Write a protein that binds this ligand. Structure first.
Ligand SMILES: [Zn+2]
Ligand SMILES: [Zn+2]
Lengths: 138, 4, 138, 4
């Protein structure tokens, strides 16, 4: 057992998340390929094919059989450092692993910051709309 | 795929 | 913070154990040199200069100022894999680190096995001595 | 040094 917070760096842990993934053999976006590209399966009732990059936390859905997970990851999150990792996990140096883990942590902060901004703006629009109606009154 |  | 069980692989953690080590600047066996060689300070009332290799668990005492910790470690525990580690911690690969950690674990089992054997033999000698006296009786 |  490696420390639970470091498990997502292991491709086999990532593959294990795809318990009910619908795209299997014959498709480009098989669980092996999705896990290779850095994705974990995060299904919901609303979004059963929802997948998240463990490293940059980009969330993608609406997968089709011909979707190449690497190509999709590159298209939607071109700055994700995981995409530049050419080595296998075991070949990473400790220094490299630690640097990747700090970059992942910065990414998680960035994702939370982004979700907080989005939530606030949803509210600010509704508020702004209401006040716009009042201002429109004599 | 597309952003959620 | 790295997982507490992996801290002993860090030279600075090892240096920190030498709170009351008596051999400082001017000596060969300074805390820096002792930590470099793989030693942790494990003092007792009985043995205040007792030091243990974190990796092979060899225990050495009776240090003199001119003792070179590497040379002592080599003399007393020539098979310790730590002595063959040429890289810094951060330069180790994950695969290499994991292999070193499995070898350390084998070493810890080996040390416990050894201490159990020693304890048993202490008892077996006393018992054997007693029965030897009885056999010596008519 | 010597073995404990
Ligand atoms: Zn990513
Ligand atoms: Zn040793």
């Amino acid at each position: 057992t490696l420390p639970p917070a470091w498990q997502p760096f292991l491709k086999d842990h990532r593959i294990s998340t795809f318990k009910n993934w619908p795209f299997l053999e014959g498709c480009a976006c098989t669980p092996e390929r999705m896990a290779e590209a850095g994705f974990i399966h995060c299904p919901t009732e609303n979004e059963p094919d929802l997948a998240q990059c463990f490293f940059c936390f980009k969330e993608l859905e609406g997968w089709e059989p011909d979707d190449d997970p690497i190509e999709e990851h590159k298209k939607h999150s071109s700055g994700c450092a995981f995409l530049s990792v050419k080595k296998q996990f075991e070949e990473l140096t400790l220094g490299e692993f630690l640097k990747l883990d700090r970059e992942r942590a910065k990414n998680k902060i960035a994702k939370e910051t982004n979700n907080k901004k989005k939530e606030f703006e949803e509210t600010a629009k509704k508020v702004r709309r209401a006040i716009e109606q009042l201002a429109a009154m004599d | 795929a597309r952003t959620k």
